[PDB]
Amino acid sequence: TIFEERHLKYISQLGKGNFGSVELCRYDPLGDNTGALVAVKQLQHSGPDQQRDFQREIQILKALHSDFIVKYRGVSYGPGRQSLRLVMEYLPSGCLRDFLQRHRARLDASRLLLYSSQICKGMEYLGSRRCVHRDLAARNILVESEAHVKIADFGLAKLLPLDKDYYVVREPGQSPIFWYAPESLSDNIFSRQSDVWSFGVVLYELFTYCDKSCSPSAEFLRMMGSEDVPALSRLLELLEEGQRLPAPPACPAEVHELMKLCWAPSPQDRPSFSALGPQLDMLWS
Amino acid sequence: TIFEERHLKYISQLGKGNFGSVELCRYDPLGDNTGALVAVKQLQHSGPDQQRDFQREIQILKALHSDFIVKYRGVSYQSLRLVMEYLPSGCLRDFLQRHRARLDASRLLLYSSQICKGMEYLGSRRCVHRDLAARNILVESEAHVKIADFGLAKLLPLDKDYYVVREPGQSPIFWYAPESLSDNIFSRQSDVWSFGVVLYELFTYCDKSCSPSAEFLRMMRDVPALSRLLELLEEGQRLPAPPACPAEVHELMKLCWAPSPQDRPSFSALGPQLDML
Ligand SMILES: NC(=O)c1cnc2[nH]ccc2c1N[C@@H]1[C@@H]2C[C@@H]3C[C@H]1C[C@@](O)(C3)C2
Ligand SMILES: NC(=O)c1cnc2[nH]ccc2c1N[C@@H]1[C@@H]2C[C@@H]3C[C@H]1C[C@@](O)(C3)C2
């Protein structure tokens, strides 16, 4: 629950954000090296807005209990009893985006549909906590084992007003625009329905095995093209025309049709993660 | 943007102080009574200290933008008046007492959620309210409340996280924190203590007989009225769990009332802990 700074042995780095970083550590009080591996998030060179949002993240994660969401283990009040480090579980198999590219050969559609379903269940639970993840993408999905994946990176995650179902972000997005829904791009509006849009994209990522040559980045930039209008503005224009990501190579038709529903123009017309769950689970049987 | 005195029709009094008063008016330049209502504040027989502070007050509130903080509207000028929006349902304390049958526990969480968010934003503007209490919260609609009364609200120095009031406040002792009561230290963490008391008010539906004052008074021979409370807060005594209060909210009030300000939760941490119940 409470992690002594001196017993967190640093090993190496897992990610370096713009205002923060995630370090792989071993919490080893006993010295014999049997202590558990943990991911530890902390801030660097950050202003007041980030420190405050970082404190929201810790509470949101502390409060999420699901097999399909990465585990909060504790916090550490750090060197000089001043700073703040967020301690989480370490999953050694790594992120899904990298895992699919490496082990592509030993993984068939069934296994891909298992992942999708676990993620969908995870996202259904986040809905139930009135929580919008806001950064759902293969790079933030972790692999617990070859048959278990988890959702991670709650940095952009936000709870809804208790009386409303949507939320507006005052400062616009910085994370890749290719997972963002149109109302998010045009108006910085976010919701469970917006997360449903992004889940369409992770299905695409999944069934393209995160192959870089047909990534959302890769595909949209080929459709947007270069012409000066900003890249955010022309993607939106592309999306309002009704243009979407194309059917992946060898994609099961009925999976591509579920994406299309995730990507409906109006948020009210996208299926809930509750509607999607069974639809994924009993696609073939 | 700026209001004319001759177009401000006086209606009735909203509040009064030892050196200040607030008035309800319709700003009615067309003269046909279709103007908007406004709460208008000004000073009366005050000293230079009050006039100075009142300008600070105008300028802070002028620059606050939150759906949970009463909206500065403008000013009217020889002697200055602060014009604000008028919320017609009045303050929360009187509302909770009047409409308790109509309001369930879930909606008290919503008012809590919204006050915390207002206090979070005041925190980010490096600003301390000093008089957080239900008597200073306003009802915009049945599902929306707003913080008001920035009379005693002070901005923290740019390079420090606390403020010291050399001339202490005559306003009620029961909302104050132990460092306030003892050494006049005010801070964002002080505002957290008082939020704890605001929670108590909410979940007791601002019932008179079990007010913070009434309850703290019941928990106390004769010495000074102040130095009995501080001696009692430093023992460990706190306000009771209200009857119409969930367990986990009472735990948030006790955390809010930790002895050391450093141990008390931020409004940033509190928020989710309220919203996720
Ligand atoms: N609990 C964890 O966060 C975590 C657990 N096991 C891991 N194994 C490899 C990375 C990694 C973790 N964090 C990484 C960090 C945050 C997020 C997710 C990972 C990849 C990313 O790019 C984006 C940087
Ligand atoms: N702009 C306003 O402040 C305001 C707006 N709408 C209102 N409707 C009823 C009172 C009232 C207002 N002021 C009151 C005044 C200051 C403060 C808040 C209110 C109650 C109090 O006791 C403490 C006296």
Side-chain angles (χ1 to χ4, degrees), chain A residues 3-8 10-80 83-101 103-163 165-169 172-267 269-285, chain B residues 2-8 10-15 17 20-44 46-70 72-77 79-97 99-165 168-169 171-207 209-220 222-230 232 234-261 263-277:
Chain A
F3 283 67
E4 307 295 70
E5 178 50 46
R6 69 196 174 286
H7 299 132
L8 285 168
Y10 167 74
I11 298 176
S12 69
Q13 285 219 137
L14 305 165
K16 192 73 129 197
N18 198 41
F19 303 121
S21 79
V22 185
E23 297 185 1
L24 159 59
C25 291
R26 177 105 64 198
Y27 190 67
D28 193 39
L30 279 59
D32 57 23
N33 221 246
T34 56
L37 300 165
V38 285
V40 193
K41 186 173 155 169
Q42 61 283 302
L43 302 187
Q44 323 287 0
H45 309 264
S46 314
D49 297 271
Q50 297 101 313
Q51 290 145 30
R52 282 201 308 284
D53 292 328
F54 183 52
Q55 291 211 297
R56 295 179 63 79
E57 180 179 358
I58 292 162
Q59 301 296 315
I60 291 166
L61 209 68
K62 182 162 171 125
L64 302 176
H65 297 117
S66 172
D67 291 354
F68 310 124
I69 295 169
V70 65
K71 294 200 175 197
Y72 170 95
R73 309 255 85 143
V75 298
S76 158
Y77 303 108
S83 63
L84 189 71
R85 301 185 72 180
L86 161 57
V87 180
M88 300 173 294
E89 59 177 354
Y90 181 59
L91 279 58
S93 336
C95 69
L96 180 55
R97 191 202 52 201
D98 287 348
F99 190 93
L100 293 157
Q101 295 181 79
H103 312 291
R104 198 207 204 289
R106 69 184 302 102
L107 301 170
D108 56 5
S110 298
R111 185 47 54 79
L112 296 185
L113 187 130
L114 176 54
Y115 298 162
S116 317
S117 160
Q118 287 172 13
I119 288 164
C120 174
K121 283 179 166 209
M123 290 313 290
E124 180 170 25
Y125 175 79
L126 275 214
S128 66
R129 304 324 302 280
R130 311 200 91 260
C131 180
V132 191
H133 188 260
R134 236 196 93 200
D135 206 359
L136 191 55
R139 69 179 184 276
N140 300 330
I141 318 305
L142 309 171
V143 180
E144 159 74 310
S145 58
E146 254 187 15
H148 195 162
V149 295
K150 298 219 197 180
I151 305 158
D153 206 347
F154 281 75
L156 309 185
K158 288 299 151 202
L159 300 162
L160 301 162
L162 287 169
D163 51 352
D165 277 323
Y166 77 104
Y167 181 55
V168 193
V169 190
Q174 297 194 148
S175 71
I177 65 178
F178 308 98
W179 289 261
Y180 280 153
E183 72 283 346
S184 311
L185 293 172
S186 54
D187 282 287
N188 309 121
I189 296 162
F190 296 88
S191 55
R192 303 188 203 76
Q193 296 89 23
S194 81
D195 283 350
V196 170
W197 182 284
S198 306
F199 179 71
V201 186
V202 310
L203 273 169
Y204 173 91
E205 289 200 281
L206 276 176
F207 288 84
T208 55
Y209 293 93
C210 294
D211 168 72
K212 305 190 225 312
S213 72
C214 63
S215 71
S217 166
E219 225 72 283
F220 280 121
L221 287 161
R222 203 225 164 190
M223 294 165 74
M224 283 183 287
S226 30
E227 319 212 332
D228 281 295
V229 179
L232 195 146
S233 290
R234 69 201 169 184
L235 178 50
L236 178 67
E237 197 173 353
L238 200 85
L239 292 182
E240 279 157 11
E241 283 173 340
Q243 297 190 25
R244 301 283 176 261
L245 297 162
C251 178
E254 55 265 305
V255 176
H256 184 249
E257 302 302 329
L258 288 181
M259 294 180 208
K260 288 210 202 89
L261 294 172
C262 285
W263 298 326
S266 179
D269 300 348
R270 300 163 194 151
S272 71
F273 288 113
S274 304
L276 276 169
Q279 279 185 86
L280 295 164
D281 283 19
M282 65 208 285
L283 203 66
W284 307 308
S285 316
Chain B
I2 310 171
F3 291 101
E4 299 198 43
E5 184 55 72
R6 72 200 168 80
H7 294 146
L8 277 181
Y10 169 64
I11 299 182
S12 68
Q13 216 84 10
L14 293 167
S21 83
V22 179
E23 283 179 9
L24 168 56
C25 307
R26 199 182 304 286
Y27 184 58
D28 194 52
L30 290 70
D32 64 5
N33 210 219
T34 65
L37 305 162
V38 280
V40 183
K41 188 195 182 178
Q42 49 154 1
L43 307 195
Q44 270 141 41
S46 70
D49 303 16
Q50 279 80 93
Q51 289 136 33
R52 277 190 289 283
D53 288 329
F54 178 51
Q55 299 210 243
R56 275 141 158 165
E57 172 188 347
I58 287 164
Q59 292 292 322
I60 291 159
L61 182 62
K62 176 167 192 146
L64 295 175
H65 302 106
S66 174
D67 290 27
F68 311 118
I69 290 163
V70 66
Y72 163 91
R73 285 295 322 282
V75 294
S76 180
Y77 297 118
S79 82
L80 197 63
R81 310 180 79 196
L82 164 49
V83 181
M84 299 169 292
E85 66 168 330
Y86 177 66
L87 288 54
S89 297
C91 64
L92 188 44
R93 179 197 53 195
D94 288 24
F95 197 88
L96 292 175
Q97 293 181 56
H99 304 305
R100 167 163 134 173
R102 201 164 186 77
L103 309 167
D104 77 336
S106 219
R107 189 145 282 188
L108 299 171
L109 252 174
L110 168 56
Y111 299 156
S112 311
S113 171
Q114 293 176 346
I115 293 156
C116 185
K117 283 179 162 71
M119 290 314 309
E120 188 173 3
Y121 173 75
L122 283 204
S124 56
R125 307 320 305 284
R126 310 198 91 268
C127 180
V128 181
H129 194 274
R130 254 188 75 206
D131 209 318
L132 193 52
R135 68 184 177 283
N136 300 322
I137 316 299
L138 303 188
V139 180
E140 167 88 335
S141 69
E142 210 162 52
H144 187 207
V145 300
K146 272 173 183 168
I147 297 149
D149 199 338
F150 285 77
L152 311 183
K154 299 308 187 213
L155 297 182
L156 294 163
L158 289 162
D159 59 354
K160 279 292 200 166
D161 281 339
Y162 68 107
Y163 199 109
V164 199
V165 174
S171 76
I173 62 181
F174 310 108
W175 283 261
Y176 285 149
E179 65 279 17
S180 320
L181 292 177
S182 64
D183 304 90
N184 310 132
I185 312 301
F186 292 95
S187 61
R188 294 192 208 72
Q189 285 71 41
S190 198
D191 283 339
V192 173
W193 180 286
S194 311
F195 184 78
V197 181
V198 164
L199 285 172
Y200 177 88
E201 279 187 291
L202 295 198
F203 287 92
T204 58
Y205 287 98
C206 284
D207 196 312
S209 60
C210 54
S211 48
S213 66
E215 216 70 65
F216 277 121
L217 284 163
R218 188 210 63 79
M219 287 159 34
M220 56 210 181
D222 196 52
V223 305
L226 183 141
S227 320
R228 180 72 188 89
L229 173 51
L230 181 51
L232 189 73
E234 291 183 0
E235 278 183 344
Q237 253 79 241
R238 296 296 181 288
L239 283 164
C245 180
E248 315 97 312
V249 173
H250 188 237
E251 291 305 326
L252 285 179
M253 297 176 219
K254 288 193 279 171
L255 280 169
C256 279
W257 306 321
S260 190
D263 303 335
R264 289 166 218 176
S266 71
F267 293 106
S268 284
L270 271 174
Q273 282 165 104
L274 287 158
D275 292 13
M276 296 190 79
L277 267 43

